[PDB]
Amino acid sequence: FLSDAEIIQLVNAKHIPAYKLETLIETHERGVSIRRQLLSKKLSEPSSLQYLPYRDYNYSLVMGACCENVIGYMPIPVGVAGPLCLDEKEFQVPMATTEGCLVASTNRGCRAIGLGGGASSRVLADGMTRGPVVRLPRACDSAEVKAWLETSEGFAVIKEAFDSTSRFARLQKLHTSIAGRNLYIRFQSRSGDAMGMNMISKGTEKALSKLHEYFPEMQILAVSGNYCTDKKPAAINWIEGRGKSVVCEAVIPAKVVREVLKTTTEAMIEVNINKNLVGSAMAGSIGGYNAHAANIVTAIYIACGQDAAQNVGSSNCITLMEASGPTNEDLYISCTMPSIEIGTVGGGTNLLPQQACLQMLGVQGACKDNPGENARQLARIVCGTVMAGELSLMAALAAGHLVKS
Amino acid sequence: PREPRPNEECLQIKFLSDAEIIQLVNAKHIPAYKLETLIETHERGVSIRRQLLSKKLSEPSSLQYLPYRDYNYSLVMGACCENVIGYMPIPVGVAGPLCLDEKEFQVPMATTEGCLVASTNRGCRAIGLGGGASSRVLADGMTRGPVVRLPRACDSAEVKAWLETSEGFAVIKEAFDSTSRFARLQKLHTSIAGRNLYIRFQSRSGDAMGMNMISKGTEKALSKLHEYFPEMQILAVSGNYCTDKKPAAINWIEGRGKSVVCEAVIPAKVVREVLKTTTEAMIEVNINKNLVGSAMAGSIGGYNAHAANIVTAIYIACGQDAAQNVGSSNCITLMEASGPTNEDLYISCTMPSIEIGTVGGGTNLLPQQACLQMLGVQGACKDNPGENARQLARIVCGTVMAGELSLMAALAAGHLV
Amino acid sequence: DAEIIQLVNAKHIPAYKLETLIETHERGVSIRRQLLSKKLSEPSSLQYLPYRDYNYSLVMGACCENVIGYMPIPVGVAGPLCLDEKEFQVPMATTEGCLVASTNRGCRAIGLGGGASSRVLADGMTRGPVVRLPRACDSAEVKAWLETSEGFAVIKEAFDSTSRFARLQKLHTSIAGRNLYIRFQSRSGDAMGMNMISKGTEKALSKLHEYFPEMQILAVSGNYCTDKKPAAINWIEGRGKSVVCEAVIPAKVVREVLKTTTEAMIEVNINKNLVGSAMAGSIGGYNAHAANIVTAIYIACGQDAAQNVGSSNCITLMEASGPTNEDLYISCTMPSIEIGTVGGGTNLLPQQACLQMLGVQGACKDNPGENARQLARIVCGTVMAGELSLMAALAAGHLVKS
Amino acid sequence: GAKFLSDAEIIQLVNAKHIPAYKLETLIETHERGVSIRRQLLSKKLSEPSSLQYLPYRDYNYSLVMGACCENVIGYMPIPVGVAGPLCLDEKEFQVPMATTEGCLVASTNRGCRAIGLGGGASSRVLADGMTRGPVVRLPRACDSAEVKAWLETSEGFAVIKEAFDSTSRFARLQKLHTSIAGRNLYIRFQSRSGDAMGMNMISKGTEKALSKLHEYFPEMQILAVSGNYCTDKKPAAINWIEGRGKSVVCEAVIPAKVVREVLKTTTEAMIEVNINKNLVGSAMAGSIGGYNAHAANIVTAIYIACGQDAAQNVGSSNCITLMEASGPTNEDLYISCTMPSIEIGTVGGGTNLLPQQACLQMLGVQGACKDNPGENARQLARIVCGTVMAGELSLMAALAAGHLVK
């Protein structure tokens, strides 16, 4: 029972620190209203928040979970590309973006796939990772810890501790690397339908404390020593995989290439080899042998409540194209994405709008009866949509249509 | 007037009911994406596509919670998204004040990752009590790297030699710059692969990120180059040598967009009280994680803790291209002992390829403009073209440093989990 | 020698077939040199290229073709290298001035600091063929099959039947659409083992073909090994011998032998070997000059010098140590040392002499693989000595002056 | 003096008051005797005393070696030298010397030369030429390092440093500068021509002089190291691949369909299929930066050892992208190209000063300095290396395509 003004006067005098507003204020929306008012007086243009919406949005799912010092929300247009004829099913793919032509392009690639009998995909691997950096007094000591971790006995004991932290966290393997007295241990584990970063970090924490029982001299320098690797480009993710590794493929009949894509199979292939393979090689790329996988990955991620910062590594992709058919005029295309970091429960997937987009795809929440299937399905959809996107952009580049917008 | 009338009578030119438009669309074959053409309002076209979509979903009511009402679609249509079915609200938090180059910024961050804003805000606090941060823009130029092809490598080599002459460069520059007042071809980096020739055009672009502007200018320069070498085949305006939205050593080494460096010294006291650790611990974690760890992982440009988190959050809030986080996140963060007792913490973050702009694309939408205005960098800087974009790049580099400081502190103190 | 040239000028008898028709190796080389001479713009150029009094019998048929002589490479010695409580005299073949002297100086600092310690972390030569199935769905199936205990068992049996040392450790598989890259890894006794692994790979691929007849074997080497090309896979997974060595150099030794301080050494190490290499976009090149040491020892010991591309992979680390943090701790980690003590150039007498000097010539019969492992440790230890000295010279500003 | 004492007396004296041993040539009169005594001293420290019995040392010119190419010398290592050729390149025919102990390498390279010759020859071009050195310097603050970078980028700034750099030698001409900041650190890549010399020494001296001049403008600058690994020398690095180092070269040739079948024992189509999936796709899957080839390192290394080059530089000199394509009236002939951006090579200085390696350089007609066109001999050698690599790629790739590698 106070006025917005009084609460403001109460905060200005170091008493309630801006970020603690919802802790005291009744309405979540009012707490946001008040923070915007404090913010106004610190801006060279006080009315700069006028166009930033905040009213009538469910903050209950956000506060204490997805964002701090909330001042509103940012609307990102959502378009739909589809149907994506994938694995004998049809999907309507939601895409959150502000880049014109991206939805139209992806939709067109979907069209060429649908008229071609559809695409097929497979999940090759599933395991989120965490790569802590640990340190022993000497390299001879860290060497000893690596050999121990490499024994079936050592692996058994740390797996017991890792798995003891969650019903869904199942340690699959360990990849260890030495740098003198430093030891990088790459923990790889299943995580149900969650992307798993949190669950994996906890497992690593418990597993490391257990390892410490056997080697008291070991110093745990950081639970993440950048050997995961999370949100930074790294050859290890490309070569070893991280999260879901998947492959997609489709054959686009010669006539579909000409009618829908406005180009030829031979042109498509020539551009692919010389842009996505040779071009990427000349640029010194590790994992970027594709046209614009990141665009598709980013749009689906924002629409489906994923962690968009993970587009850095989730975008890794190699797109291949070759002649197919009795006459060799049809287009075979494949996209291989070894490190899709994705999930359908927790984080932003907890928010209603993002859940709507996930429901649209039929992968919302946990898959009881088959843990991880909702996340694996979303990964396949991502890989398939990337392929649809690749098909369209490559067709435009081959035809000299990138100009069109 | 509803109970569906026959299609013939339904031929429109308010006009008709939803059921009838839906019937016309299904009967004839007006794909859902052309709705805004016929419909009097953008919102009704959206409402209809949504209704058409529901019928194709296994859970028809899945769109229930996907908002769509009361949103300016006129700004979206024809420039930002097609086949629109609504919008996705991303929570926006604020970290500040960020004390950068004697100014104070309130940095908006759009995210769904808990603690990211709190952590960036904490780093800002340490920077502020440390007397502020300073930054410099080292280079500025967007790029496009087309792949071109000649009959033989001796021919492509000939084109490369020609492009490297002051004579040939001037002619190409002329054609390139004629594309617009802001297109100013700075330089050319060429790479040969047998008979293929990769040409990296680089140029300022005012306050725009410049992707479209540079592409058009590149298309005209190649047109001009083709006059001199009619046997040259333009294989693709983008042959992945730019490089756009894919990890590439070339962006790390040559830069792309804005190259920025930032720095600050955090007093030993502020490291203990605000960051909950010591200078020595921060340094030991920095070297072994950001340098050695990244090296062991085979990273090119990923010598940092979480620049991508900061870049992505600001990008989404300010109408940038979030897919550009791939290369924009490139960053190396260094930490070192500083001061009298060597107990203070020197830190710097160097980001060679921030791809950013304050005009065009998503920056034309109102909510994003509000976030750009909050920073005082919205739209073009008529008096000093490109200054608003440069300023935003400096802010992005500064906020990344604040983020790096806080996460690294938590890692050193064991506060991540 | 004069009348023989006549015959060769006529068809049906190429220059590379001379040894088969002549009674002496040397004479064969001599005639080839005379034949070659007539085609040179400067016929007398071969005047200083030696060829006499050399054992070609061991070379021809296994080490080189169309032989016209030999190339002498100066061999110097650096040591003693005090490693794992032993003392080694390291032979180094080079034409680079100051290299042996620098390496010798690094050995000196290490010996005055009580020696170095090393450990072999892994051992396994690899081969990475590329096969292809009709569809990615089929490739995915072959990958899944290979990952089952049943599938791995059958191809391991086939692989291991090609040799007593062919003992398949594991498979790392990567998919690229319908292509499938399979990385076979195995111990190989004391041989570098490229030949053995390749043959074991061929037999296993045919076995795999019996289970998947639609599988096309594109190449025994699809560049996934990876042999003699820079690749992150070798850096991350290892190839050949993965080794780590270390030592602590007393502050006094850093000053008197190395002419610098521990602090300056550390600053140069971090900013050159860590930060510089990062700015240059290096994958695996986090060192000063490991390649120099690797190359000289390889040439001296009959190794394959072309393998210095991957074998030189190294991360050199330095930090303050001891009671007053003034002593220098240094470590060198090399994950992909491709080496051997039997086969190829190691069958030649001069190179066998350099190998014997190290006590690692030939096979270790009572403990197969121990001679190659010991040599790998010597290489890593010597690289560390080389790193110490060059880094000291860069810190004190003595590179050019030396 | 020394000749009046016996080997045993010298040994007893070296051990007596501890003479290093690397100093034996200071004491003893003849070069060969200093080597003999070092061998004797060393032998007593070996688990097997006679292990040096087969390491030759006699009848070798040590005068050219001592004080220039090696120290603490105990002999020399003979590397068999074979010849591949003729290599028909740019309307000329080269007989290529290759020092190797790897069986089939010379045969295979000779085979590829055969295919090229029957195809009308190869063509090559030198795209760029400039040795580099990339020192690391440090300023008190990032703002200061930014200032140095901006200064080096001005024409005035570049002119003064170039004057200082070039003042170092008649053949040292600074071409360009590439800079990179890392906080308060500044990495400056100096790139310069160097006549026919590989240039590392010359380039390093010029850099030293240029940095001392830069220090006049920036007294607060600390020169941390003359090589901050930004060159980059003898370590794999994307900068060499993208920017070039030494000589950037490209080579090409078309092999008639008949020749592919008869000489190479395979098919044009098979070759292309193997090239794409091995050299492009495979290298990509392996995370390669610059290794988009089959075995350029084998050829580079063999020619380097035979011609007195620095074999350690095979690390970056091997960088190569091999491309293959269908060509001709019926799309049945084989177009192949190899592009090598960073061949570090020279024909003057170092081991290039020894007679045996000078003989191999003379074979190619590239020994020493080109009087009328400084650098032309080194450039010709780089063209030959690239052409020979291409010959080598042709043969191994044919063998891999036909299932012939292991025999």
Ligand SMILES: CC(C)(COP(=O)(O)OP(=O)(O)OC[C@H]1O[C@@H](n2cnc3c(N)ncnc32)[C@H](O)[C@H]1OP(=O)(O)O)[C@@H](O)C(=O)NCCC(=O)NCCS
């Ligand atoms: C815009 C573009 C799709 C135009 O399509 P087009 O092949 O020239 O010709 P059409 O307009 O007849 O349509 C072809 C197909 O595209 C799709 N498409 C075209 N315009 C569309 C739009 N505005 N909205 C949604 N989907 C669209 C349709 O699904 C399909 O036609 P149909 O299903 O009605 O039979 C094409 O120029 C393109 O994809 N450009 C490349 C964009 C790109 O990838 N850039 C980088 C990412 S932004």
Ligand SMILES: CC(C)(COP(=O)(O)OP(=O)(O)OC[C@H]1O[C@@H](n2cnc3c(N)ncnc32)[C@H](O)[C@H]1OP(=O)(O)O)[C@@H](O)C(=O)NCCC(=O)NCCS
């Ligand atoms: C959550 C975290 C910020 C709290 O740290 P802390 O030092 O124990 O918290 P404190 O209560 O002592 O406050 C210290 C500072 O944190 C910041 N801060 C803390 N909680 C905050 C919140 N809810 N919202 C905004 N800012 C917050 C403030 O700027 C500052 O406090 P102040 O108002 O007194 O000036 C810290 O644990 C952290 O940063 N974790 C790492 C998160 C991360 O980077 N992980 C990956 C990205 S999500």
Ligand SMILES: CC(C)(COP(=O)(O)OP(=O)(O)OC[C@H]1O[C@@H](n2cnc3c(N)ncnc32)[C@H](O)[C@H]1OP(=O)(O)O)[C@@H](O)C(=O)NCCC(=O)NCCS
């Ligand atoms: C040439 C260099 C070794 C001389 O070092 P220095 O410390 O200035 O000279 P010193 O007379 O004090 O000798 C110090 C130590 O160096 C070693 N050393 C010096 N000259 C040597 C020589 N000519 N031969 C062999 N070993 C030598 C000795 O092991 C040791 O002395 P000691 O064993 O007699 O007690 C040194 O400047 C250096 O290593 N430069 C760097 C070279 C380099 O790494 N470049 C790249 C590869 S070539």
Ligand SMILES: CC(C)(COP(=O)(O)OP(=O)(O)OC[C@H]1O[C@@H](n2cnc3c(N)ncnc32)[C@H](O)[C@H]1OP(=O)(O)O)[C@@H](O)C(=O)NCCC(=O)NCCS
């Ligand atoms: C061994 C190999 C050279 C034989 O090739 P082949 O075509 O089947 O054998 P041929 O007798 O038909 O000769 C074909 C050509 O090879 C070359 N050649 C064959 N044996 C040779 C030898 N011993 N010495 C020199 N050149 C030889 C010839 O130049 C040429 O024949 P010609 O000049 O007499 O007309 C071939 O199998 C090969 O190159 N394998 C791959 C080796 C490789 O690159 N591995 C990795 C590097 S070591």
Ligand SMILES: CC(O)(CC(=O)O)CC(=O)O
């Ligand atoms: C076209 C592209 O730049 C992506 C985009 O425009 O959003 C990617 C490419 O380089 O092909």
Ligand SMILES: CC(O)(CC(=O)O)CC(=O)O
């Ligand atoms: C902590 C980190 O995983 C990022 C995040 O949690 O969002 C990055 C790292 O330090 O590896």
Ligand SMILES: CC(O)(CC(=O)O)CC(=O)O
């Ligand atoms: C000194 C060095 O160039 C190697 C050499 O000269 O033989 C390596 C470096 O430190 O860059």
Ligand SMILES: CC(O)(CC(=O)O)CC(=O)O
């Ligand atoms: C055959 C090869 O290994 C090189 C060699 O054996 O000398 C290279 C390749 O991977 O093709």
